[PDB]
Nucleic acid binder design. Structure first.
Ligand SMILES: Nc1ncnc2c1ncn2[C@@H]1O[C@@H]2COP(=O)(O)O[C@H]2[C@H]1O
Ligand SMILES: Nc1ncnc2c1ncn2[C@@H]1O[C@@H]2COP(=O)(O)O[C@H]2[C@H]1O
Lengths: 197, 197
DNA sequence: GCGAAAAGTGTGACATAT
DNA sequence: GTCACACTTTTCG
DNA sequence: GCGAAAAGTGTGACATAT
DNA sequence: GTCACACTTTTCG
C-alpha cells in the first residue's frame, strides 16, 4: 500500500539466476527492493574464495548502505540465487519519497537493524564456535530460511557442501567430513538435498 | 540542530568507568545517546570468552536495534570505557519524535548503516585473515580512532595485549607473541602503549 | 523429462597456525 | 590455544 | 613524584582443528 | 585446511 506507492516510482528489471546484480567497489546510486526472488550477498578474499554474508529474499531492500552519504561505494557483491524481479528507484528519488512518507524509511531501518543484529551474531559464531558447531547452526537456520520443503520428519533444504563452506568458513571437503559425522549420528540425512531432522 | 530538540526530552545520566549500562538479554525499551564519553560494545560466550564488537564514542546512539520491533532483547553488552554522560529516551516516545521530525531517524539510520558496513568487514577479517593480519589491521585502525596521540613520527595508542586479544580473537599470549614479531619486523614499537609506525 | 555437458564431490596423506 | 608462575608494568592514594 | 596494590604479562612446552 | 582426479550428481538446451 505505502509499498505500492513506493513501487510505483520504481522500475522493475528482471535478472536470471547467477546474475551479479550489484558489485563491490562501484558507486551506489540505486536502492533495490526485491519484488520477487532470492539473492546472496558476498565478500571475496583478498586474492581468493568468497564468503556468503546472507541471503536476502523478496521484501528486502539491497543497496541501502550507500543511501545515507554521498560518494559511497558498494560494499559487497549481490548475486541472484533464483530469478528475480528487482524494483529500483534512485537515491535522490528515495529521499523525496522519504519526505512524502516516512514509513518506507522506517521499514528500511528495520531491515538495517536486523542485518546488524544477525551479522553481530556471525562475528560471535566465527569467534566462539568450531566449524562443526557453525555447520550445525547453519543447517538449523537454513531449515528456517524460507525455501526448505517440509519433510514429514524433518526439514529439507537443497544446498551444496561448497555453499555451506562459504557460509561457515571452511573447505567443501571439511563440510563433507562433518556432514558425514552428523549423518552417522542420525541427526542429518543428505544427497545434494539435506534433511535437518 | 534537530539534535537539541531531541535531547531536551531525554533524561541525561552519568555512568562511571566500567559501569555496565546494557546487559545483553535485557528487554529493549530505552534508546540512549552518548553525550560524552566512550563505550565498548561486546558479546561473550556461555563459557566466558568475550569479543569486542566495537568502541562507540560520543555522538553515537546506543540501543537503536530494538526501536524497530516490539519486544526484543538487547543484542550485546555495552560497558562504559570511561565516564559517560548518556542521554535516555523511552522507545515509545522516540517513535513520537520521528513523526515530529524525520532528520533524527535519518541521523540514526546513517549510524546503523556505517555499522553494518564495519561489522561485515570484521566478519571478513575473521574468516579470511590470520591473527597476524587481524592484529595488523587492528593496530592500524586503533591509530586512527579519536584518542590516538601522536608520537612525533608515528601514532601512539595505549591498549593492553588483553584488549587487542578481545578485538582480534586470540589469547593475550598470542597477541604478545605476534606483537614482538611485528617489533623484529620494525612495524610496531611496544612497551604497555604502542607506537604504530 | 530427456541426455550431454557441466558442476560438485570423496578420498587419504599431509602440514600447520593459535 | 593452553597451563601456572613469578615477573613486569600501571595505576593512584 | 613516592611507593605499595592492582593490573598486565612472558614464558615454554604443549594439544589441536581445519 | 591442502592437493588432484575419478566418480556422482545436477544443470539446461
Ligand atoms: N552484512 C550484511 N548483511 C546483509 N546485507 C548486507 C550486508 N552487507 C551488505 N549488505 C547488502 O548488500 C549491499 C552491498 O552493497 P551496498 O553498499 O549497496 O548495500 C549492501 C546491502 O544492501
Ligand atoms: N556490531 C555492532 N556495532 C556496534 N554496536 C553494536 C553492534 N551490535 C550491537 N551493538 C549495540 O549494542 C546494543 C545492544 O542493545 P540493542 O540491541 O538495543 O542495541 C545494540 C547496539 O546499539
Amino acid at each position: 500500500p505505502t509499498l505500492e506507492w513506493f513501487l510505483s516510482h520504481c522500475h522493475i528489471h528482471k535478472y536470471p539466476s547467477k546474475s551479479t546484480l550489484i558489485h563491490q567497489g562501484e558507486k551506489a546510486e540505486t536502492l533495490y527492493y526485491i519484488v520477487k526472488g532470492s539473492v546472496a550477498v558476498l565478500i571475496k578474499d583478498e586474492e581468493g574464495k568468497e564468503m556468503i554474508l546472507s541471503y536476502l529474499n523478496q521484501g528486502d531492500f539491497i543497496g541501502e548502505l550507500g543511501l545515507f552519504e554521498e560518494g559511497q561505494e558498494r560494499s559487497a557483491w549481490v548475486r541472484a540465487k533464483t530469478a528475480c524481479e528487482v524494483a529500483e528507484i534512485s537515491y535522490k528519488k528515495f529521499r523525496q519519497l522519504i519526505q512524502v512518507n516516512p514509513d518506507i524509511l522506517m521499514r528500511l531501518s528495520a531491515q538495517m537493524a536486523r542485518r546488524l543484529q544477525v551479522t553481530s551474531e556471525k562475528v560471535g559464531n566465527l569467534a566462539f564456535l568450531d566449524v562443526t558447531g557453525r555447520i550445525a547452526q547453519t543447517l538449523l537456520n537454513l531449515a528456517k530460511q524460507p525455501d526448505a520443503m517440509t519433510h514429514p520428519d524433518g526439514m529439507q533444504i537443497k544446498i551444496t557442501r561448497q555453499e555451506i563452506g562459504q557460509i561457515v568458513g571452511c573447505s567443501r571437503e571439511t563440510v563433507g567430513r562433518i556432514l558425514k559425522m552428523l549423518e552417522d549420528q542420525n541427526l542429518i540425512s543428505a544427497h545434494g538435498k539435506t534433511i535437518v531432522v
